[PDB]
Design a protein around this ligand. Structure first.
Ligand code: HEM
Ligand code: HEM
Lengths: 379, 365, 379, 365
């Protein structure tokens, strides 16, 4: 694993220096978002040194060191390609196919060999970013990047705690007393998300993030195909909650399509779990079907807690869209299909908040029926 | 409708018969005696259950999915377990099981889905589906419900602890996020201490030993004798042992224990457990990071790491001096409790010294 | 499974009648490839009856009857959508999104839920086409369709026999005596393919196939995304042979991309096996590395048989391209990106035949070195 | 390098020591005796192997992948099996295994990958990697090579038969393509008959019973006794039994047999086998298609189907009267051979009548 080590050590050293030093130049500019005619020397070094190290890896050909080893390597290749994209060394709408031949072949080889997208994925920097003596992979040494990544990690892990609790209710049923504890575990995990997102909101520098962090999550070509950038939402957890709570519907083209466009962007194990939720029942419909149990102790106790969980999830979606996406994407973007991705994100936030709409299906009425169901039972 | 017919029976008459039978046993002076008592109730339980099982055995091969099959196997196991409790079947008395139909069915399902052909802990705890608030049980006794509910709470708390620990593996012990997982682990283990305490302060020692425990006895399935389920039949607890490095897979005593429980947990738990047997542990990781002693992450993470090991080892003594003390291989149970607690011993390998070295490693700071 | 049964029984009855009767009209025409202003009544019935049956299924929502049941249902939905595409009831370059709302949602739901493409796949009509009292799913009752499907099935099954034998050599090694038998089993299976393809070549009606069979394998939209038609080559087997024999290379963008574009078009189990071959060694390189064993009995005996297998595979690719694709696609198409897909198919045939080229990597030299290696050893 | 050091030993000195030892045993008059003979060679085999194993046990947890671990377990099992053959270790003589290091290592790997902690058939047959033409073996005797090679050929032929049969399931018995799979199945089963015949006509009855078979004896791993491998330890053969409907998973006798062999085959073979236990079979399918008697597919497919059942049942008698006849649970071996052959019996359920009904069903045509 000499060649593999050599590339990783490069990613954890010079790679960070080159990008950092390059970000310094971009920030000094007046445009700040411009990359043309700047750091031309640093770009050649980053491209050159990375390619050689990658080329050494591409020579070894087929290797089977296990999923973790392969995924880690693919991450470095993706981190490398992502940087080249940020610095305009490679640009999709400018090419017909990727100019980074070696890296593309290697990335497409590993990705297809382990069932993941042939590029940098969220897990590469968050849940599966191995730290060496305290430092883990990063594009730059900027404090704002670390804040973004760490809080995405905290957020993601909090959602996993919430989806795991929800999945354990399935075998017990909504009337099970133990389901009341899982429901509370779920509630706490979702609150950890609200808190996690708040801290990020109160510490991340809006400007530094939009000009020095975000530009590394851009779409770029791998081979001839264009692959979009990773999202902090690329993991089963969040969608597992949507389906299990019944807030979203797999039978709707809009939602299933979204799942399809993200499967390869998460771990194989997360894909398996997500797909399975698409053919399992949900708690919403369960409670709705238990109308003749309205005067049951477990019903009032569990429905009450359930409804609270549905609200927290919707709260977390409003917090994300209304606050996070708003303060670091929409605003800085108006100053410097954007209105399209914003509109999709809205239907998503409203789908979780269960608001009233006529253009899309929502649980507003179902949730209201259940809320008004708890009224009749407190007697 | 046969599956449901049997399930509905298990959730109704089955509970009545056992309950009514437990009433007779308790009135006795011996109370542990079952000979010449409830002979009528025993015949009914055996008879009604067999007929319902026989109807199922006729359908032959069925593939309704893992959950459906496991649930059915649970009812068959619950039925056979009852028969064992009431002496309708007794291992040291037989050469092979007298419950022919139930045995065939149980062995068929179990082997078909990779689980033991009898009632397993998950059948009554994590995978016990409730209907309108009531879930499978042997009797309607309050002490059974206390035992099962707290075993469930305990088990689920351990799963939260093992899941947090496994997420550190890809991040490493020096990762800042590993400090949060380590704290999540600490909290989950505390939930176990609290969970066990509540059980200790509410369960009726007598009712449990004469009306609850006798349903977890060993009985024959076919010609083979299969031991009773244990609240410790799940990956979680052993995942923590290996990940924290408190136990060693390279030791016959421990790997044998794992082998004797694999079939007693869910296939998914088996997969996870086996995997931990070929993965590194945090203990050795910290020990190998001696040249990082003056690192911020080393001081912070290690402290919590040691607090985690102490909560686990300590939560071990509590259990050891409870379901084992108040109620052959006694030594094998002491070594297990000693490895977890990392006590000092000369007969078995322990982390006592390694843990002390690490505790005193925080000293310099 | 009433609604599921109702739809299947429809697919096996009226569906076949409507398409058949419709094919009769198209054939009578002078253009014969025209579909405008013809069978307008039959089209409305096919579209109408199918949609209603699908709509009934879409209502049931999430169901978990097992992989086989779900895959079978998805097949009927795909068969239905494919027909609508053939009859121009739906056309990709004419739409922005699919006009078949219910069918799209259902197809995308099942597909994503079990990890397969949301449309009709080769297995749906070949290896996983269940027959009822002798009759299995089909678009029409035409004899030429049955010939096409049956021989694709025979061909596919023969390739599976060849890939399975090759994979069993891996744990034994190329010098193992038992590997000589597997190598012979492989040789026989590949010959069954040559024979299978020959029979198809000598019995299929070139015209009927191009105007009455092939038009059902066209690309159509599912939701907003366009999904290409199934190919008799959508299964692990063929590519497993390519990689195990070392005739193709996973480290090349061109090949890995091709694998990615077909994974969802085969069974999950075939995907698993294929991906794994991308990180395993191959026999070609093994033999090349055993140069200091040239005077070994197993070497001459096994290398000789190996080289024969490589030739048969290449023979089967030439037979397919030069004969089959030529007589039923290229010619009838010149009479009535086509030159693009033909060019890709050529690089593929030459990759297996191991011919000499400068534009792509081939085993021509490696195979020649090994052939000339057997000469030195027969002494 | 420890893994390779042990493997290279198994492929060199290990073979020499055992071979040289077999020479001494054969010269004797008893020939089956091992007491007071080759005492020097035994010490060397035990000593050299243990040291190499001890080096491996030190590395602790390793995750080099299933193939690497399984291969290593095989060497450890081959080593322990030899020690058993030479009486260096004997089950009915011990309470626990005297080979401490080897036991721990074997139990560790086996449990970590889900296989029995000893030498399994695949270790010498389908998964025995050859180096420059030579693959793992206990001795250099020609009769061992004959036994192993033909077991391998037999096994691979059965895998071809089970794979063809499983591909009919999704197509159905009335599918035209099922007629080809049925013929592929027929040919594969014939390859088995031929394979077994060659073994019968070449293997030296004496050399095999005194120099080959004694290496497949049962021995202790830890404290548990694990039986020796059988050329029948793989899914294939049992997949054919269930798919053809010749055997029944709902019968304790058969499901128990499956349970006692799962760990003796590859995890992938276990998965496939278990699944067959909850799937339909062709026998019952044909029986249920009585109102299709005058169908073309019914006549053609059924004929070949019956020829397949007869080849299997007949290939059973051959084996039964060979490795069992020429060389307790003898009855359980008769019933198995009788279910496969579908003979007439009153003590166990068989397909004799069902098969006769189907044979006479072709009569009307
Ligand atoms: C200021 C920081 C953040 C910003 C600027 C941000 C921005 C975005 C953007 C613009 C998208 C849309 C997808 C695309 O077109 O690529 C997205 C998706 C998503 N984000 Fe964030 N994000 C932030 C933090 C977080 C955190 C901490 C979480 C927690 C896990 C998270 C979870 C998600 C989810 C789950 C999705 C998908 C939509 C859905 O299914 O509802 N994000 N984010
Ligand atoms: C006259 C009958 C047949 C014709 C017209 C035909 C045509 C084609 C076409 C045009 C393609 C290109 C893919 C696309 O753009 O969709 C293709 C692919 C393929 N065909 Fe056929 N085919 C026939 C029979 C068969 C049979 C019997 C087999 C046997 C399994 C088969 C195996 C393949 C393979 C494996 C591929 C992929 C290319 C590769 O990886 O080499 N085809 N076929």
């Amino acid at each position: 694993t000499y060649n593999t080590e050599a590339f990783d050590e490069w990613i954890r050293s010079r790679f960070v220096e080159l990008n950092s030093q390059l970000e310094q130049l971009y920030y000094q500019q007046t445009d700040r978002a411009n990359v043309q005619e700047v750091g031309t020397e640093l770009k050649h070094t980053l491209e050159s040194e990375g390619r050689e190290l990658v080329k050494a890896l591409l020579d070894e050909g087929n290797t089977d060191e296990g999923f973790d080893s392969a995924f880690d390597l693919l991450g470095n290749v993706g981190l490398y390609m992502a940087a080249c994209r940020r610095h305009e060394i490679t640009e999709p709408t400018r090419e017909t196919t990727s100019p980074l031949l070696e890296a593309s072949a290697l990335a497409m080889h590993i990705g297809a060999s382990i069932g993941v997208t042939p590029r940098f994925a969220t897990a590469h920097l968050t849940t599966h970013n191995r730290a060496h003596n305290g430092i883990y992979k990063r594009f730059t040494d900027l404090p704002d990047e670390k804040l973004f990544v760490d809080y995405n990690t905290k957020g993601i892990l909090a959602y996993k705690r919430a989806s795991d609790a929800l999945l354990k209710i399935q075998p017990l049923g909504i009337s099970h007393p133990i389901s009341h504890d899982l429901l509370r575990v779920t509630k706490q995990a979702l609150q950890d998300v609200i808190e996690s997102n708040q801290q990020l909101f109160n510490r991340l520098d809006t400007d530094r993030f939009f000009y020095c962090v975000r530009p590394y999550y851009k779409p770029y070509r791998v081979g001839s195909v264009v692959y979009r950038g990773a999202n902090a939402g690329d993991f089963a957890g969040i969608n597992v909650i949507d389906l299990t709570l019944g807030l979203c519907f797999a039978n709707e083209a809009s939602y299933s399509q979204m799942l399809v466009d993200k499967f390869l962007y998460m771990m194989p194990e997360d894909q398996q779990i997500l797909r399975e939720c698409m053919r399992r029942p949900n708690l919403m419909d369960d409670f709705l079907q238990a109308k003749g149990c309205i005067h049951q102790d477990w019903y009032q106790e569990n429905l009450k807690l359930f409804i609270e969980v549905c609200e927290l999830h919707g709260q977390t979606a409003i917090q994300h869209h209304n606050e996070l996406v708003t303060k670091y994407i929409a605003e800085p973007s108006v100053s410097m299909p954007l209105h399209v991705l914003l509109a999709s994100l809205e239907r998503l936030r409203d789908r979780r908040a269960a608001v009233l709409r006529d253009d899309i299906r929502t649980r507003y009425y179902d949730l209201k029926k259940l809320k008004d169901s708890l009224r009749l039972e407190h007697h």
